[PDB]
Structures are given as C-alpha cells and as structure tokens.
C-alpha cells in the first residue's frame, strides 16, 4: 500500500487548507490556503496517474492544467487584494463586513 498514503497526505493537505481558508484574518493567507487546496488536488491527480494510469498519464496533464489555472487565479486574487487594499488601507478579513444583510 502506497497510493493510499499519497491520498491521505493529499486529504490532510486539503483539510489544512480548509482550516485557514475559513480562519485566517489576513486576506493573503486565505489565498495561501487556496493554493494549499489546489496542491492537495494536484497530489491526488499525480498519485492517481502514477498508481492507476501509468501508461497514459492523463492525471499529469490534468495537474499541469490545474497548476497553470491556479497560477492565474492567484494572480487575479492578489490583484483583487491590492484593489481592496488601495481603498481601505487594511487587508483584514474582519474589516470587509460591509455587504451584510
């Protein structure tokens, strides 16, 4: 058994990203947690492409696309963080409670 260890490590990385997506006060640490989530998914994909689909490695192509889309999504997320930092001069997530009920 070695694929299940890669999957359990990817699940632990996903839950470490979850605790931190919904915990962190800094808005950039939320994007760091989002990158942790995406790298957990990529660990699942590369492990599945290794232990199940080693000849046609479609999970590695999937992980290349996830890496390349997650790069652009982190880029536009830091753009949105800088745009919200320009007006309100904090980055604290507890000061972005303006669009309530």
């Amino acid at each position: 058994m070695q694929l299940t260890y890669v999957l359990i490590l990817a699940a632990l990385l996903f839950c470490i990203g979850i605790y931190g997506l919904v915990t962190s006060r800094n808005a950039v640490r939320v994007l760091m947690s989002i990158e942790l989530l995406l790298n957990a998914v990529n660990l699942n994909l590369i492990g599945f492409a290794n232990y199940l689909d080693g000849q046609q490695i479609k999970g590695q192509v999937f992980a290349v696309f996830v890496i390349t889309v997650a790069a652009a999504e982190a880029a536009v997320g830091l753009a949105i963080i800088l745009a919200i930092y320009r007006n309100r001069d904090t980055v604290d997530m507890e000061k972005f409670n303006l669009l309530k009920w």
Partner: protein
C-alpha cells in the same frame, strides 16, 4: 526493502512530514512572511513528491510556477501590503476557530474513510519514464481544447489583473 525502496519510502515520509509541517506553518503562524516562505517550502516538498511518483516534468513545472512565479508574486504582494496592523482578537473567535477545526477534522475523517475503504484499481504495468513526450502528444489530442482555452484564460487574467491593480491618474 534493500536500498532503493527503502530510500523511496524514507524520502516519501520525509517530504510528507515537510508538506504537513510547512503547511501548518503556512496556516498557524502569526508572521505572514513566514507563511509566504513556508508556502515555497510546501511547493518544493510537493515537487519532490512528484519526483517520487514518476512525474518529473510536472515536478519541474511545480518548481517553475509555484516556487518560481506564484510564491514570488505572493511575496511581492506581501511586501506591498506590509504594515503593522493591530489585529485585535474578536470575542466570537470560538465560533470561527472551533467550528473550522471540527469541519476540517470531519472532512479529514470522511476522506480517510473513503480512501482506506475504496478498492482502487492498482496497475501492475510500470509507468512511462518519458512523461513530457506523452504530455506533448496529449496537448494536441484529447487535451487540445483546454490547451487553447488556457491561452484565453491567461489573456483575460492578465487583462483583469492589469486593470484592477492600476492607478488611473488622468
């Protein structure tokens, strides 16, 4: 476990402990620059993990993008928003943190149950060492439409991130 599979298991457990420890340091650290450097530590240990499971081009892509470009961008934006904010702890911190911990532990217990419970269809054929040639054959095959759509995604992401991170002094 003579010497090769022993080295592979020792490397896997060392890199897994490095991912776990550095990812906890990304979350559970007060200094945000330490999280922004331990994120690169996470990405490097994950690239070593990809090296272990026969994905060398994807590991080099992981070093080139996540360490080389995404972490550098994150560090640049961290230096851009670097201040000395107080971050006064709100009185309802239990409702966020304890709920977040029990949700993360519930998702981890559920995922561990379905991972250890599922009969995965393990292959006996060894994988191909020539990964980048089959990925290049895949990019102009089955995966051609995402390959062309990724260019439009990158163009739109560059357009929007130039627009939103700009000053329009006119």
């Amino acid at each position: 476990m003579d010497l090769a599979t022993l080295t592979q298991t020792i490397t896997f457990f060392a890199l897994a402990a490095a991912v776990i420890i550095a990812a906890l340091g990304v979350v559970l650290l007060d200094n945000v620059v330490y999280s922004a450097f331990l994120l690169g530590g996470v990405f490097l240990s994950i690239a070593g993990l990809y090296i272990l499971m026969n994905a060398d081009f994807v590991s080099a892509a992981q070093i080139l993008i996540y360490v080389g470009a995404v972490n550098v961008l994150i560090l640049f934006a961290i230096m851009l928003v670097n201040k000395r904010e107080t971050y006064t702890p709100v009185p309802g911190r239990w409702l966020r943190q304890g709920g977040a911990a029990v949700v993360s532990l519930g998702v981890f217990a559920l995922l561990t149950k379905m991972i250890l419970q599922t009969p995965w269809q393990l292959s006996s054929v060894p994988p191909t060492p020539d990964s980048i040639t089959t990925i290049g054959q895949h990019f102009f095959s089955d995966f051609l439409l995402p390959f062309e759509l990724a260019s439009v995604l990158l163009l739109m992401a560059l357009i929007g991130a130039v627009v939103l991170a700009r000053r329009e002094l006119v």
